[PDB]
Amino acid sequence: LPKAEAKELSAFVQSCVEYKTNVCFTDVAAYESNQKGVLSSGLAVLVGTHKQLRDPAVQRLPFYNPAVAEAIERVKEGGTYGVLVEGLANAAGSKFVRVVVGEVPTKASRNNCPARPDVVTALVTAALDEVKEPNTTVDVFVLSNAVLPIAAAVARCGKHNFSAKDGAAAAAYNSGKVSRLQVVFPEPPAIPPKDLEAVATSTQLCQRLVDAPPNLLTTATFTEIAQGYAKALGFDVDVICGDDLCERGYGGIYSVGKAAFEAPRLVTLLYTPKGTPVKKVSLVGKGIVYDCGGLALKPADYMKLMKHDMGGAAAVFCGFLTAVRLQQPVQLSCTLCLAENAIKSYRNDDIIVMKSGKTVEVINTDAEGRIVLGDGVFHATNELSFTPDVVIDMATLTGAQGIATGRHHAGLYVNEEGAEAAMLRAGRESGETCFPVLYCPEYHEPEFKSNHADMTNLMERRDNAGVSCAGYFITTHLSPKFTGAHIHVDLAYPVFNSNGATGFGPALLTEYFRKL
Amino acid sequence: LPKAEAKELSAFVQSCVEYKTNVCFTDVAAYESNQKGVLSSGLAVLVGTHKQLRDPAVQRLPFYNPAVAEAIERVKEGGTYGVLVEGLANAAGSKFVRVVVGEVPTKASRNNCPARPDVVTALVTAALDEVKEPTTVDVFVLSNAVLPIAAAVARCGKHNFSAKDGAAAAAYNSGKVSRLQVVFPEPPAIPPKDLEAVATSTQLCQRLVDAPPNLLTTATFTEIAQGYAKALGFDVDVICGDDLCERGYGGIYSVGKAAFEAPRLVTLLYTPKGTPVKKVSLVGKGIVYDCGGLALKPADYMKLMKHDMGGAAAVFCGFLTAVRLQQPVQLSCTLCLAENAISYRNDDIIVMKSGKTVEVINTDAEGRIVLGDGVFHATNELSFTPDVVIDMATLTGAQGIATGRHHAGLYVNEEGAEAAMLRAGRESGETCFPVLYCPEYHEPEFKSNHADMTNLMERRDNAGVSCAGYFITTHLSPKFTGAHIHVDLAYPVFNSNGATGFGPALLTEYFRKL
Amino acid sequence: LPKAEAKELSAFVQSCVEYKTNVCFTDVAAYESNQKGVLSSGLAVLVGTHKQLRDPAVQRLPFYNPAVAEAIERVKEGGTYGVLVEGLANAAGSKFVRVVVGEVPTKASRNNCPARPDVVTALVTAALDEVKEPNTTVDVFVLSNAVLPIAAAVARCGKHNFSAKDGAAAAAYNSGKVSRLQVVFPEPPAIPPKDLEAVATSTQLCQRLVDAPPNLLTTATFTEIAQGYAKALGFDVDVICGDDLCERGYGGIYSVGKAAFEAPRLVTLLYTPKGTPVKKVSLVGKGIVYDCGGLALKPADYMKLMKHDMGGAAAVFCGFLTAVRLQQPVQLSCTLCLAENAKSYRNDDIIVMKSGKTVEVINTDAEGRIVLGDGVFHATNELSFTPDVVIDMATLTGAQGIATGRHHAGLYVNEEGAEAAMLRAGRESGETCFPVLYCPEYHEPEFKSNHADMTNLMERRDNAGVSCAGYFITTHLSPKFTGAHIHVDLAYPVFNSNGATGFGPALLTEYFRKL
Amino acid sequence: GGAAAVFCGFLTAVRLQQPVQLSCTLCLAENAIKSYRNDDIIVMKSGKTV
Ligand SMILES: [Mn+2]
Ligand SMILES: [Mn+2]
Ligand SMILES: [Mn+2]
Ligand SMILES: [Mn+2]
Ligand SMILES: [Mn+2]
Ligand code: NA
Ligand code: NA
Known about the structure:
This is part of a larger assembly, with four copies of chain A. Chain A is α/β, with parallel strands linked by helices. Chain A has two domains: 1-188, Rossmann fold (3-Layer(aba) Sandwich), CATH 3.40.50.10590; 189-516, Aminopeptidase. Helices cover 36% and strands 21% of the residues of chain A. In chain A, the strands form four sheets. Chain A has an eight-stranded mixed β-sheet with strand order 7-8-10-9-13-17-14-15, with helices on both faces. The radius of gyration of chain A is 23 Å and the shape is globular. The two termini of chain A are 46 Å apart. At the A-B interface, α15, α17 and α18 of A face α14, α16 and α17 of B. The structure holds manganese (II) ion (MN) (5 copies) and sodium ion (2 copies). Residues 495-496 of chain B line the site of one manganese (II) ion.
């Protein structure tokens, strides 16, 4: 590459490797003792349910006055209402302090998170529009004690840490428009503040990785980022790259990424805790650049979904980091299936020899993301120093996921009922919600029928459980060594919203591991 | 209107009202006692799993010989293998007796019926190709799952509805359909007469859905409903034409006001003897020439339009089975019947019976509009208030993408009622799978500038099956606070050979466990 | 026609005929002397530019305090910033009064209104979201003196008077969510408050007509509404209806509307002022129900645009009403081309237009310009006078949005003088326009037909789409007519995300004022 | 085009008095008014169903 590009990519790698969260955590009493009632800046936020906002505990808060009381009355459900308070002592020394009240709904269905962190994100995002200075800290008083989903929700909200606006490209694409946020819980949090910072950091790193454009986050830079963390946090990293993938039988990931300027890479990270592990889990993530397609939606729609194609790789990677930082008692592998699908007719009707030994007929070159997951899955369940009890693969795979489970619920295709319930619980507890997709291999297998290969890479009929079939394809490349629960997570839509990446995935994994 | 057309419709109405099944049920012991070794015809079918076929009880069957044993060893999983038995005694007097062996798979997921009735149907269909004189064919099933097998055999082979080879003159009744005698290993847990009733309702549903829209119209459906009401002795209420407008049913009225035949809200009522175990209301979509959406291409919806009566046919035949078996459930069945015929009505704001207003941003999606009126009717205008409201419809193309060709999508507000219906699907073979229930996220998709709601979700890729179901739930009566079960059966209602008769058996099995 | 629908339609007709604006107008000095520092309710709005908000006069306003001064400092350009004032006197008896400051940008191009009423509407729309009770009066303090565009802008904003939400259907689709608005100018207004009320009423009446669905605003009901205003305001009405259109030679409008349940109608309204008219002007409006189509956009796009296809007829109708109410010195006719169109049917038909020229119908979707052909000939050949200017307004093409955008109506006009006049009317009224290419030499060949005088649609869509649609209409002008013809394509400016904008009437009003 | 060609060919045979016994059947109908009559089964004059 040119010297200017190489310098830029190195700077971007460093910004991801050294990324630290803007969010910190505390509780009302500690805040009272540490900050002596003085607000951090000229902006404060109060978020809670209709009931919680009227609790007497609110009246004892430092910023409370009759004006704030009226704001609580005038605010709409799922909306904000801002009021000024003159002569309220703050660190910035502002003559006024803006207090914004946000009402969270209590309505929540049996498939959602009761604390409704989706609305908490929206409320705080709206409130941060009234931020004055870029160097200030905003106190976010939350009236809920669900520390994990709120930690993720606040990490998710506001201006994104990734930005190319207003000369931020000269500062390694670190946004200067992000405000520091201090979340203040009522009670001391059940999960320690430092652990919550780690969760918040992973949500925002995941967001950065998915927001980053494909000319910054490439197969090479992602690999370098993974290697950077391995050195810093002290975990093992293994990289099977380029022609070595072909030599060693990884025909799927090789075939998909062989046309690119940068070689395809199967990067596997290993974490083994001190003492006896509670479970042995393997993570596999789809991280294919310029790769998004299918038959369920129009071609123009898949170009919009291509924007967030690293969502799977980012989710498993950041979930892995949190496990290492929290020192969770789980033996963990994380395999990043990284390739750049460069240069429609090319590779069409190719027959590839997968690492599993099974042959795949490429009937559609747009659907070359489940192929790399096939190699990733076999590698995890066959080629590692341990055999996992559970395999979790995450990928922004199908447009059918949106039609099936929607914008907020990732699709779960899983072989065992118990594993499904566990992950569903983790979604409701974390706020990164999921919903099951049809598991029935008898009806999925015939859709991949091939005249000359063992299978095709795409279902014949699009209207026959679209999410499920993509999941099934991946399961056919599981190793016979594996006898445990396979969880396929299709997160094509939950990985983003109108403002960009959401950092969906890592907190779901963190909560899943806590209950193992 | 013409005499020739009017006479044809009357003959078709009689064929559906007087429909009798071609299937009967018995067991191996009762079979040997009544027939004493003589087979009913020159064709016999043996269907079972790999283990079941090698059971010692198989070699003690009338038709068994060394050739049949070789069939059991040569047959492939999910395939058939035929052999002749020379000089075998049979009532038809055939020189040979063809024995077709079919192997059923044992593999079945936690969302599928363990007996795999889908393959049973496929096996028996392939075996009936070698029929000589379309004669009663003996089908020996090695499974004891009587209810799903009853439905499985009822839907297999040649369909009773036909317009081939001069069948139009004989009220579209097929002469190619062979009689079938299913022989279970042991005496069935459900009476043979009850199994026959389930088979009949499956085939009547098949007949109604197979029937083209120029035979099964809004008028002929109601006449068929009135026929069974007179025969079986149950009440029937019909709100027809402009009476729907005056009485506030703007949804179903607006949809069918353009048609030659008027729209009809046909409510049937069945109350059993004594205390009913539950009060259940059925609501079915029966709109003629009405199929559309945004998830699939326009050409795809034209193919799905052929089976638009599936929702109405499913609830109607399930109601009939409950009356014939005398199931202890207070039952109502509202048929939302209309013909969407003749840009028209685009951006119309109609006042629904619930009082809520609907902006028609898409005229193709008007199936959920009539269901809204039917749902409010069942939950507000009946003499009783139901505990469970079940609506069934061939509603969305998104259903196929979500749950597939074999599983009806379930959008239901209570977890208990969902698990019940899912169990009913696995027990009966007419399988289902749940679709996301989350009204918080479905409501914003129907936002409207001038009306209370639109009739179609703004974004196509945000739980399409769920949203279409949510719309219907907004028109539930405030009086109702029980379980609502929306069943999207757009795809399971048909296959390559036509209608499946999906729905009735699922309801029956659901009613049996209440 | 069932009795339920008949009663519904009659109730809707009355609601349009008897419509009264929620807005009234006054000024600071008059407001003080009549209300004495007691606000009308618990919400007040302050809308002005950065400079205007920092004018010394702002400190002297009744609601001003250091919290409001801070709101002026923190608010963003084009945004709002709300603050509570405790114990401020107000007639609603609210313990706190909410003051919402909104900043209007000064940036305005040579083709836009300097007052930026587009933002004013948005600011006041945002401010009204924080309303507690709907049955109150909100004081709206504007720091601008451009009274006409502000009047139209404020009439435009907030909840629409038409609604079918929450039982509004039982009250003739009159919204119960609309708040009364008292606009308070700095100086006494150059245009009388009652005249501004009339302009506001027309904007909102136009909004109601376009918002109204096609099952309520039909060809019969619009006609009944026009008749109702004729009786009340005292102007003449002529209605050529049904088979009479065919017999009298109006083959265009007849062919388009003959298939429908309700018959097509050519409604013409005449207004003659007292004394010498400054100009004789004829208005023509497209009001075709279920009719929207073309080749420039996808079929799905035209279905969305179809919701506002009464915008042309509504614009001219309400522009006519304002002329009658303000008694503007302009002899005025207003021809409403009304019909219901309800793809293969009538394709390749050759219809004999009222002008005598034959039209081949190559595309059945584009028959809005056909009804305008008859309307334009009627106005220029069949009336008791001969107009000096002919103005036709229609939501005609999707190309209009591609050409001139969502905020500027496309102008196709033969004389540069009448073009410049209408452009000035747009910039002054705020209902902006922009010229589309006038060049008949290059538009004529696109309508070449084998057997008719012309086709109804251009052969090549990428050859000035807005212009060619306008050219088609000019071919059916009477040979008697030798004046200026102004074709206004307002396909997009007639609506926004919230619904109808009521675009059109205020442009006509301001156009007449400078004749 | 089809009905016109057959009709005008007939007229030429009648005017020229060509030595061919000729019948001319014009299948005339106005197709109004896409979903309408979709999946209908019709009994043709031949007795076969379509
Ligand atoms: Mn969203
Ligand atoms: Mn969004
Ligand atoms: Mn199938
Ligand atoms: Mn099939
Ligand atoms: Mn806009
Ligand atoms: Na300050
Ligand atoms: Na009761």
